[PDB]
Structure formats: C-alpha cells, structure tokens
Amino acid sequence: MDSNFLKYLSTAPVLFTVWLSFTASFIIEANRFFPDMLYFPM
Amino acid sequence: DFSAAVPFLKRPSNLDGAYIGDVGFDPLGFSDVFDLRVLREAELKHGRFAMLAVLGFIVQELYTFPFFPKMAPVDAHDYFVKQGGGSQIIFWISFVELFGVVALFETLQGKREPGDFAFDPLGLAKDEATLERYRLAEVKHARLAMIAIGGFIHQYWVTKQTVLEQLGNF
Amino acid sequence: DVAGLTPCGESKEFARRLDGSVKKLQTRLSKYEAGTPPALALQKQIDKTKNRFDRYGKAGLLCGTDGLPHLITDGRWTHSGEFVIPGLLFLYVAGWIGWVGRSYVLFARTADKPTEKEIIIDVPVALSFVSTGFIWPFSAFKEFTSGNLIVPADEITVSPR
Amino acid sequence: LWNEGKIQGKGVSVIPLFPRPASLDGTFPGDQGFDPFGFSSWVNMKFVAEAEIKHCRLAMLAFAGIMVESAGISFPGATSVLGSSKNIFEIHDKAVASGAMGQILLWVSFFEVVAGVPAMNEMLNGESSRIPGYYAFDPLGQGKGDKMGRMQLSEIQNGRLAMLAVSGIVHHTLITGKGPL
Amino acid sequence: ALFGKGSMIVVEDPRDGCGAYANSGACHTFLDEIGDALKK
Amino acid sequence: AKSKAVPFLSQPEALDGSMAGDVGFDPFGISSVIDIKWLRESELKHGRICMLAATGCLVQEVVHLPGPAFSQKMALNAWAAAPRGGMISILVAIGLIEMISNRFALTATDMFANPNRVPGDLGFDPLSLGANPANRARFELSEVIHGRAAMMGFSGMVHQMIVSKQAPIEQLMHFKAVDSSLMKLGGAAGNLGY
Ligand code: CLA
Ligand code: CLA
Ligand code: CLA
Ligand SMILES: CCCCCCCCCCCCCCCC(=O)OC[C@H](COP(=O)(O)OC[C@@H](O)CO)OC(=O)CCCCCCCCCCCCCCC
Ligand SMILES: CC1=C(C#C/C(C)=C/C=C/C(C)=C/C=C/C=C(C)/C=C/C=C(\C)C#CC2=C(C)C[C@@H](O)CC2(C)C)C(C)(C)C[C@H](O)C1
Ligand SMILES: CC1=C(C#C/C(C)=C/C=C/C(C)=C/C=C/C=C(C)/C=C/C=C(\C)C#CC2=C(C)C[C@@H](O)CC2(C)C)C(C)(C)C[C@H](O)C1
Ligand SMILES: CC1=C(C#C/C(C)=C/C=C/C(C)=C/C=C/C=C(C)/C=C/C=C(\C)C#CC2=C(C)C[C@@H](O)CC2(C)C)C(C)(C)C[C@H](O)C1
Ligand SMILES: CC1=C(C#C/C(C)=C/C=C/C(C)=C/C=C/C=C(C)/C=C/C=C(C)/C=C/C2=C(C)CCCC2(C)C)C(C)(C)C[C@H](O)C1
C-alpha cells in the first residue's frame, strides 16, 4: 500500500477520528450485550 | 494510427499492444483516464467469475448434489441466501479477495501482471509461446462468458426456462 | 439499611417504578397488531425493562423513598461495587493512557523532527507504547524511584516571581 | 532388466502423445514417460517413488484378498465368525465389527509409525541412502542382479496394474451389486 | 498416591459403545452424516 | 524473490528462512511493521497455549478430576462449573509465571533488551530434552507446526461447542447437522435492531 497514503492515515485527525470511533464503538457494543450496568456486579 | 478493431476510430494511445487481447477497442476512453493495470485486473476477474458462472449454470441443471434440493440457479441464489451456504461462499470469496487486495497493490507497485496469481497446478503453460496463446484464449473466453452470463440470467427472467431446456424447447 | 435506605428488592416505590414503566409501554403496545414490527420492538422493550428492574432488585442496591437506587460511596466493602471497584477499574485505564501518552512524548523528543511525530504519529512505535501500559503501576513507580519521572525544580522554566 | 532406452528410460514413452518432460529423470525404476501435469518438477522424487511403491504393494495384496474372498476361499472358521457372503464390502463391515480389521489396523499402523515413518524421514533427509520402497525384505533369495533390475520394473508394473484393477473391481461391485469370480 | 478410593479419577469412554461407521439407533457419527448426505 | 507460500506476492522482508516454520507467509506485511522477534514470541506463546487448550478440551471430555465441580464433559460448561477460587488461582499463577519467566522484561519496549534473549526461548527445558543440538532444528519446526495446528484446531473446537452444545469427541460421535433455523449470523442492523 502507498507509503504516502499510510503517512496520511497516520496524521493526527485521522487517528483521532478512527481511535475514538473505535473506542466509542466498543462502548456501544458492550452496552448492547451487557446493558444497564449501574454497578460492578458483586 | 487507427484502431485495429474499429477502422474509423483512432487508437486510444494507452492501448499500444502492451496487453494480450488488445484490439484497440476503447471508445469511451476509460484508459485515457484510468490505470490500465487496474482495468485489466477487473477484466480478468469479471471474466473468470463469468466463466465459472456459465459452467455453474450448465452443470447445475445437469446435476445437483444429493444433500441440496433440486432447483433452478436463480432459485439457488435465493435459497442459499436464506439457507446459509451463500454467506459461506461470500465469506470465503472475501477471504481470498483480501490477498487479492494485496495482489492488486503488488500490480500497482509494478511487480505483477494484472491477472497473474501464479496458478498453474497442472503445468499446462509450457513456455512463452503457448502461454501467450493461452492468455489470449483466456481473455477471449472471459469476454465471451461475460456476454453469455447476461443472456442466461436475463433469458430465465423473461422466459422461466433454463438455458439447456430453452435450447431444447422453442 | 445504611443511611435509612431500603434494599431495592423490597422497596414498594421501586415496585411501582417497574409497574408504571411497563404500563407505559403496554399502552403503546395496545395500538399495534401482534406480529407487526412495532409490536415486536415494544415487546422487546418490556422484556428489557423488566430484566433491568429484576437485576437491580437482586444486586444489593439500596432504594430511597423515591424508589430509585442510591449509591453508597463511603468505602464500606458491602458497597464497593458501586464506586471503589469501578474507580479501581477507571484508574487502571487512566494511568495506562497517561503512561502510554507520556512514553510517546519522550520518544518523539529524540526524533529528527519532534513536532512532526506529534501530528503524524509513528503508528508502529505508538502501538508499541500502548501495549506497554498494562503494567504502568510498576513501570511508573520504578520510573519515579529511579529519578526519571520527576525533574528537579531547577530544570523547569518559571515566571520571574 | 533395465532396458534403458527400450523400456523404462530416457527416450521411453508409454504414450508419445505426451512429450517426455525434462524434469522427469531417467534413473527411477519405472520411469517410462507419463508425466503430463508436470508433478516431477516440484515434488520430492524420492517421496513420490516410495508412495508409488507402497500404493502398488497394497493394491497387489488387496487384489489377492479380493480374489480369495470373492472365490469363497477362506481360513478354517473364518466364515463361521465372519459372514458367509463373498461381497468384499460386507466382509469388511463385519470384520470391522469382529475386531479383525482393528487388529490389522493396529499392527499395520504400528509398523508404519515405528518403521515406516523413520524410514521415510531418513530416505528423504539424506541420512541413510535407502532406495525408495526398500525394507530389506528378501527372505526367499531371488535378489542379486534381478533385485535392482527387472524385478523393480516387474514390481512397479504389476503394482500399477493392480491399482487400476482393484479400483475397477470395487467400482464394478458397486455398480452391479455382484463381485468378480 | 494422592487420589484415594473415595475421590478417584473419573475415566469415561467418549465412543459411547458404538463404531465409526454404519451405526444403528441413538448413535450417528460424523462419518454416518457423510454417508447420509451422499445417499439422499 | 517471490514468496513460496504465496507465489504471486513478493517475499516479505524480515522473513529470510532462518526461523522455523518460515515459508514466506506474510501477505498483509505485518513483519514490515512489527519486529519479527515479537511476532515469533507471540506465535510460540499462542501456539503453546492452544496445544494445552486443545488437549484440555479432548482430555476433559475423557478424564475428570473427582467431584461434581469437575464433571463437565462439555469443556465450555467447565468454565462455569470449576471452582471460581481455583480458576482465579490459575489466573494469578499465570501472571506470576509471565513476570518471572520473562524476568521483568514484559513489554514491547523491554522484552529482548538483553541481546541473549531469543523469541520463544524462556530457558524452559526441565528434562534437558533439547540438549542434543542435532534434534534442535526439527524440534523448533515441529513446535511451531504443532502450535499453528492447535491454534486452528482449538478455534474450531470452541466454535463447534458454541454451534453444537456438545463436547468435541461426542459431537463427532453423535453428530447433528446445522439446521440454520437457529444461530443465523449477523442481523443486528438488518431488522433495525431488536
Ligand atoms: C497522555 C498524555 C498526557 C499526560 C500524561 C498528561 C498529564 C497531566 N496533565 Mg494533561 N493534557 C494532555 C495530555 C496529557 N496530560 C492533553 C492532550 C491536553 C490538552 C487537552 C492536556 C491538558 C491538560 C490540562 C488543561 C491540565 C492537564 C493536567 C495534567 C496533570 C494531571 C492529570 C490531569 O489533570 O489529566 C487531565 C487531562 C486532560 C484534561 C486532557 C487529557 C486528554 C487525553 C485523554 C490525553 C491525551 C492522549 C494522547 C493523545 C496520548 C496518545 C498516546 C499515543 C500517541 C501512544 C498531568 C501532569 C492538569 C494539571 O496541570 O494538573 C496538575 C491540568 O490542569 N493537562
Ligand atoms: C509381482 C509382485 C512383486 C515383485 C516382482 C516384487 C519385486 C521386488 N520386491 Mg516387492 N512386494 C510385493 C510384490 C512384488 N515385489 C508385495 C505385494 C509386497 C507386500 C507383501 C512386497 C513387499 C516388498 C518389500 C517390503 C520389499 C520388496 C522388495 C522387492 C525386491 C526384492 C525382492 C524380490 O525380488 O523378490 C520378489 C520375488 C517374487 C515376486 C517371487 C514371486 C512371489 C509371488 C509374488 C507370491 C504370490 C503370492 C500369491 C500366490 C498370490 C497369487 C494368488 C492370488 C491372486 C489369490 C524386488 C524389486 C525389497 C526391496 O529391496 O525393495 C526395493 C523390500 O524391501 N517388496
Ligand atoms: C498458595 C498455595 C495454594 C493454596 C493454599 C491453595 C488452596 C486451595 N486450592 Mg488452589 N491453586 C494454587 C495454589 C494454592 N491453592 C495454584 C498456584 C493453582 C494454579 C495452578 C491452584 C489451582 C486450584 C484449582 C484449579 C482448584 C484449587 C482448589 C483449592 C482449594 C481446595 C484444595 C483441596 O481440596 O486440595 C486437596 C486436593 C488435592 C491436593 C487434589 C490435587 C489435584 C492435582 C494435584 C491437580 C493436578 C495439578 C496439575 C498437573 C497442574 C499443573 C500446572 C501447575 C504445575 C502450574 C484450597 C482452598 C480447588 C478449589 O477451589 O476448591 C473449592 C480447585 O478446584 N486450586
Ligand atoms: C486471522 C483471523 C481471521 C478471522 C476470520 C473471521 C471469520 C468470521 C468472520 C465472519 C464470518 C461470516 C460473516 C457473515 C455474517 C454477516 O456478514 O452478517 C451480516 C452482518 C450485518 O447484518 P445485516 O445488515 O446483514 O442483516 C441482514 C438481514 O438478513 C438479517 O437482519 O454483518 C456484520 O456487520 C456482522 C459482523 C460484525 C462487523 C464488525 C465486527 C467487529 C469489528 C472489529 C474490527 C474489525 C475486525 C474485522 C471485521 C470484518
Ligand atoms: C486456469 C487453471 C485451471 C482451471 C480451470 C477452469 C475451471 C477453467 C474453466 C473455464 C471455463 C468454464 C470456460 C467457459 C467459457 C464459456 C464461454 C466462453 C461461454 C460460452 C457461451 C456462449 C457462447 C453462449 C450462449 C447462448 C445464450 C447466452 C443463451 C441461450 O439461450 C442460447 C446460447 C446457448 C447460444 C487448472 C485448475 C485446470 C490448472 C491449470 O494449471 C490453471
Ligand atoms: C504463562 C504462559 C503459558 C500458559 C498457560 C495456561 C493456559 C495455563 C493453565 C494452567 C492450568 C489450567 C492449571 C490448572 C491447575 C489445576 C489444579 C492445580 C487443580 C487442583 C485441584 C484441587 C486442588 C482439588 C480438589 C478437590 C475438591 C476441592 C473437592 C472434590 O470434590 C473434588 C477434588 C478432589 C478434585 C504458556 C506455558 C502456555 C506459554 C507461555 O510461557 C505463557
Ligand atoms: C517442552 C518441554 C516438555 C513438554 C511438554 C508438553 C506439555 C508437550 C505437549 C505438547 C502438546 C499438548 C501438543 C499438542 C498438539 C495438538 C495439536 C497439534 C492439535 C491440533 C488439533 C486439530 C488440527 C483439530 C481438530 C478437531 C476439529 C476442530 C473438529 C472436532 O470435532 C474434532 C477435532 C479434534 C478432529 C517437558 C515439560 C516434558 C520438559 C522438557 O525438557 C521441555
Ligand atoms: C440482481 C439479482 C440476480 C442477478 C444477476 C445478473 C448477474 C444479471 C446479469 C447482468 C449482466 C452481466 C448484463 C450484461 C449483459 C451484456 C451485454 C448487455 C453486452 C452486450 C453486447 C453489445 C451491446 C455489443 C457488442 C458488440 C457488437 C455490436 C459486435 C462486435 C463486438 C461488440 C462491439 C462487443 C441474481 C441471479 C443473483 C438473483 C438475485 O435474487 C437478484
């Protein structure tokens, strides 16, 4: 894959948008399978 | 110079006999805009899909596997959408197409012919001459099967008869 | 119970919360036919609402007079799953993010163009750092005691006053 | 014997329709052209030779077993415990159920792991210079010049014929329901 | 020997008393499923 | 200079045929991004875990420790049945093993800090079975191969336990085919939820 295109995807706004979309996405998935967790179950 | 295929059309200029199967037919000038390596990769990929599809029809009327129900190939598409084997085929094709994405990057980076996957298990290609004739035959068959594909699917829609049974009747 | 609160499993106001929440959904369901997509959507919401109320009742949460769960955060161990353990989980992630971010800024200082490493991140090296964060409490304390976390006051620029 | 050049050699073709490839060497007992798909180019020749001789020897022994068990010929009391049928398929299923097939499986697999796998590993590594298919199993003499000569070619051709014939016999029994003899 | 007569190791047989192929009854192996598909 | 595993791709750098199990397979080019030493450490570790895990599933079908807490032929059911205290004991012991066997060089920036450290080589040879240097190359090859095969095999066994609520050997001996009327893949967004 082109190294200048990979250097473009390594730029701060793309990584910030991708990482926080990935981060938001597994919070969303964790609340789909395991909803309404007000407390650590113990 | 003039196009070999269309005498009155000028040659495209990105089609200078570099690829085998080149008859200068490119009126829309997609090769003046787009990379011809990408276009040839797609040509051979679409054509190989079409060739497997036309054979796919013909064999599927003649025979079907005992564990699967007998039915027409378009009905097979819908049955295997809802049964699960369609997603199987889609997954494994997509899996191979991942390494195809790597292959197309290798082609763009200059290190591979557009449809070459080094797939010669039976050693049918012997030397340069027979390989050039084989790939000319492959291109011609690939284009012809793409045409053929449209006919079998569209004709089944218009008249609900299979390709072999449609030759048999009418 | 604690602070005059009632366990949610025997709170009558918690019981009325669950019932009112389901009556509100059932009257929306009364306007749809059985197999419709709006009926299945609301029937799945009545199942989810009941499940949540059942789980809260059996969890050891304490309800108020208002029938809502209340959190006890004074440090007692019977209630550590409401703040202390979520907090321990948070600080592990937070220190991980901090240790990993700190490790990359120190790497980028030794670069050919240090400010280009911060707008164009060296993703293989930055991923090398993110994996290291799992033992940040040991790595950061050893960093502290080995004199590499804290810089002395006389290498820090301050205002004249 | 060898008949190098006449049969089983360089310039020997069973089917001159297919040109004899270069990659197929002319020193392996039984090489008479016949490499269409070009497998000799990339496979280990020593490995595929050992595999060919072993497939040959099973085919011969299985052919003998099929003939005996389809002529009704048996060992004393074998038909008493096993079936009285001459269907090779039916005998296999009931000799499996009797444990006899399990005992043959056990002992074949024992020989084939403790002796066959080390023999294969050394023959391909280059630690022993064992010719393929050799297990020093010549109790009743009949070796010497013949052992490296005609007998190697006679064995390989009788084995190829045994493979084709055994496949033929089993599929004829399948399509008919009646075995041979 | 670390395991007494009470609290002894439990060694069961997973083959459940039937064979690999050509079974009859409440025992249908994977090889039987290949035979069932090929004859249908 | 093409790959031997994938003949139409270029042979990947950092793969030079030195390592055991090296056949030129890295189509996605992870070796160009991630140091091959870390990748081989992780491959040997994943494979060693999966050899134990695949053997764990099959033997746990056959042989059990005494007691009702250890009587689960289905291995996925054993996760819940096995005493929690002892399961967390296993986890804690694994963590202690991870720090000590790696000698506190745990991370992506300090494992292999010692130039003597070799990928996958933790000094574990209790019975000195690798003492013979003649067997060394084929042991390394067959360790890598057993590890790869067991990764694939354990993955299959777990997801066949999910699909068929049966233990692996008695799933082979009491096989039932997939009806497709259950466990359809995907679909969370096709019906727009619910
Ligand atoms: C991971 C990098 C990092 C680290 C270790 C710290 C460390 C600290 N910061 Mg923060 N800071 C950072 C990034 C970081 N900062 C960034 C990006 C900003 C801009 C928003 C700030 C803005 C900021 C302010 C305004 C203040 C601090 C303060 C502090 C101190 C107390 C902790 C705190 O209040 O957190 C607070 C953290 C934030 C408000 C923002 C953090 C945002 C994200 C989560 C961190 C950045 C992640 C980064 C992209 C890492 C990528 C790593 C990857 C490339 C490998 C401590 C010195 C406080 C202080 O001086 O108190 C003594 C304070 O008042 N910082
Ligand atoms: C026509 C068959 C045939 C031929 C020509 C050979 C020839 C050879 N074999 Mg092979 N072999 C065969 C069959 C054959 N074998 C079978 C079936 C087996 C499995 C039992 C073996 C197992 C075997 C081993 C394990 C080894 C050899 C070896 C050898 C070599 C030296 C031995 C020798 O010359 O004595 C061969 C002598 C004869 C063939 C005389 C004839 C005896 C006949 C065939 C017995 C007939 C049984 C019976 C009557 C069946 C007919 C009736 C039935 C239809 C009902 C030589 C190249 C050795 C070697 O160096 O390999 C490279 C070696 O290590 N062979
Ligand atoms: C600090 C040491 C220590 C102590 C005091 C205990 C104490 C206890 N353990 Mg724990 N355990 C420990 C370390 C320890 N464990 C470690 C390090 C591990 C991880 C390897 C475990 C894993 C473990 C499990 C999985 C279980 C226990 C259980 C128990 C309890 C019942 C013990 C019993 O009845 O034994 C008397 C019984 C025996 C001595 C039978 C022993 C069976 C054999 C020896 C097992 C085979 C070992 C196997 C080969 C492991 C090899 C890997 C290892 C070398 C790394 C008891 C509270 C059980 C429990 O929670 O019960 C409620 C339980 O199921 N333990
Ligand atoms: C080296 C390891 C190799 C792993 C190979 C993976 C094997 C299994 C993969 C799927 C098998 C077949 C799938 C058919 C199943 C299928 O396609 O279902 C379809 C499903 C969407 O549902 P639909 O819109 O199709 O609904 C259709 C209607 O018919 C039913 O309502 O697609 C998905 O999005 C599910 C997958 C989650 C997508 C996100 C996954 C998590 C992201 C993590 C980061 C990326 C990782 C890779 C993402 C691709
Ligand atoms: C490459 C590779 C290998 C391979 C391979 C494979 C699988 C090769 C398969 C190749 C195939 C399947 C070629 C098929 C081409 C079909 C064509 C050109 C269509 C013709 C239809 C026409 C003209 C029509 C029509 C009609 C219409 C539309 C509708 C009707 O009403 C009427 C009518 C019937 C007249 C192997 C593995 C051997 C190894 C080797 O080392 C490398
Ligand atoms: C670190 C890491 C790796 C790894 C790894 C992994 C996955 C390691 C997993 C290891 C495991 C699963 C260890 C299990 C130990 C079980 C024990 C000790 C059972 C004790 C039973 C007892 C005490 C009892 C009892 C009794 C009770 C209470 C009452 C009775 O009624 C019943 C009973 C009689 C039985 C490796 C090595 C792969 C690679 C790399 O280096 C990285
Ligand atoms: C190193 C060292 C030593 C040691 C040691 C040890 C503990 C050595 C143990 C090594 C082991 C346990 C190796 C196991 C490999 C397992 C494999 C390859 C399984 C693959 C499964 C597959 C392909 C499958 C499958 C399946 C599928 C999915 C479908 C299923 O329905 C069924 C099925 C099962 C067929 C010691 C300690 C002695 C000291 C020494 O000084 C140094
Ligand atoms: C959607 C969907 C399905 C489907 C489907 C599919 C794949 C349907 C097929 C679509 C295709 C392949 C249409 C293409 C037809 C080819 C044409 C029109 C070329 C004609 C040649 C021309 C005009 C001239 C040629 C020329 C002349 C004059 C002579 C000289 C040469 C040349 C210049 C070339 C299913 C089955 C999956 C089911 C599913 O439930 C729903």
Side-chain angles (χ1 to χ4, degrees), chain A residues 19, chain C residues 100 104 121-133, chain F residues 33-34 108-109:
Chain A
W19 184 261
Chain C
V100 159
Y104 190 82
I121 291 90
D122 204 15
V123 167
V125 170
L127 278 173
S128 313
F129 284 126
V130 303
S131 62
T132 64
Chain F
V33 169
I34 309 195
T109 69

Side-chain angles (χ1 to χ4, degrees), chain B residues 14-99:
Chain B
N14 289 40
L15 266 56
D16 40 43
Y19 293 164
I20 300 104
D22 167 61
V23 300
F25 174 72
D26 180 28
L28 208 47
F30 267 178
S31 309
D32 296 294
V33 169
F34 299 128
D35 202 83
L36 201 54
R37 293 175 297 198
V38 166
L39 281 158
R40 197 27 110 84
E41 174 137 5
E43 169 149 63
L44 266 180
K45 190 174 281 170
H46 270 89
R48 279 151 185 178
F49 264 118
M51 282 187 279
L52 288 182
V54 48
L55 192 60
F57 291 109
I58 301 168
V59 179
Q60 277 169 231
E61 295 95 8
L62 294 168
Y63 165 83
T64 46
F65 291 131
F67 39 86
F68 283 144
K70 182 52 208 160
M71 58 184 175
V74 182
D75 310 339
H77 173 269
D78 281 273
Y79 179 84
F80 286 92
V81 168
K82 68 185 289 184
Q83 182 259 348
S87 71
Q88 266 288 317
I89 292 168
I90 283 304
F91 166 78
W92 288 107
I93 289 174
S94 309
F95 179 79
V96 173
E97 286 270 331
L98 260 52
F99 317 104

Side-chain angles (χ1 to χ4, degrees), chain B residues 91, chain F residues 184-191:
Chain B
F91 166 78
Chain F
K184 67 159 300 299
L185 299 166
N191 62 348

Side-chain angles (χ1 to χ4, degrees), chain C residues 21-156:
Chain C
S21 314
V22 179
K23 303 312 154 274
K24 198 183 189 153
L25 275 164
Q26 290 177 355
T27 179
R28 294 186 47 210
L29 182 80
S30 278
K31 294 185 287 185
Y32 292 112
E33 276 81 352
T36 57
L40 302 182
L42 298 167
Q43 190 53 66
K44 190 62 208 83
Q45 290 183 229
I46 296 167
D47 292 332
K48 282 170 185 175
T49 297
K50 289 177 186 297
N51 285 341
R52 176 192 327 112
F53 274 96
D54 176 65
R55 195 203 313 106
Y56 285 2
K58 297 161 54 177
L61 296 157
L62 276 65
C63 275
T65 310
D66 51 2
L68 304 168
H70 290 195
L71 304 193
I72 305 302
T73 69
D74 49 49
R76 70 187 74 231
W77 299 95
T78 69
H79 283 96
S80 60
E82 313 162 312
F83 181 80
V84 179
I85 294 156
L88 280 170
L89 290 159
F90 175 82
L91 288 172
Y92 187 60
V93 176
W96 186 321
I97 299 169
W99 181 249
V100 159
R102 185 185 184 267
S103 296
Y104 190 82
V105 302
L106 296 174
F107 157 82
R109 273 177 211 178
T110 74
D112 61 357
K113 298 150 171 214
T115 63
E116 191 180 34
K117 297 293 182 182
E118 314 188 303
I119 56 169
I120 313 165
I121 291 90
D122 204 15
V123 167
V125 170
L127 278 173
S128 313
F129 284 126
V130 303
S131 62
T132 64
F134 71 110
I135 47 164
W136 77 266
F138 295 96
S139 296
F141 186 72
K142 181 105 176 66
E143 187 84 52
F144 164 68
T145 51
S146 76
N148 282 304
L149 198 60
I150 305 298
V151 304
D154 67 51
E155 292 84 3
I156 316 182

Side-chain angles (χ1 to χ4, degrees), chain F residues 91-116:
Chain F
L91 193 73
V92 167
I94 283 168
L96 298 169
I97 290 166
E98 287 270 49
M99 72 176 184
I100 300 160
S101 67
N102 289 279
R103 299 175 203 171
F104 302 146
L106 300 185
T107 71
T109 69
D110 68 356
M111 192 180 293
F112 322 113
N114 204 327
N116 299 168

